[PDB]
């Protein structure tokens, strides 16, 4: 389970959540934001 610098694998750094999901899932999430949350399940890393 260590075929890459593990930081990307654990989302310490790399691309944001809205760009590593099956886009259907993102459509589903943005389509039901109000009455059922999902936006606090995956972290988008930040890099200085």
């Amino acid at each position: 389970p260590s075929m890459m610098p593990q930081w990307s694998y654990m989302h310490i750094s790399g691309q944001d959540a809205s760009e590593y999901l099956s886009p259907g899932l993102v459509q589903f999430a943005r389509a039901t934001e109000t009455y059922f949350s999902l936006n606090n399940k995956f972290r988008n890393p930040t890099v200085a």
Binding site: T34, Y35, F36, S37
Partner: protein, 50 residues
């Protein structure tokens, strides 16, 4: 037997219903609703258990 909440006499079910219908909260665990979405004649503001 098993149907009080917040050390009051109220049932869990009624509490859940009121929380939902007042703020769409409860399915994701309760917590104090934010200020602006809770005005003077709200529900949670005037909930005194004794």
């Amino acid at each position: 037997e098993g149907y009080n909440v917040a050390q009051c006499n109220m049932t869990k079910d009624w509490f859940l219903v009121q929380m939902l219908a007042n703020y769409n909260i409860g399915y994701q665990g309760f917590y104090i609703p934010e200020s602006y979405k809770d005005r003077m004649y709200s529900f949670f503001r005037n909930f005194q258990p004794m």
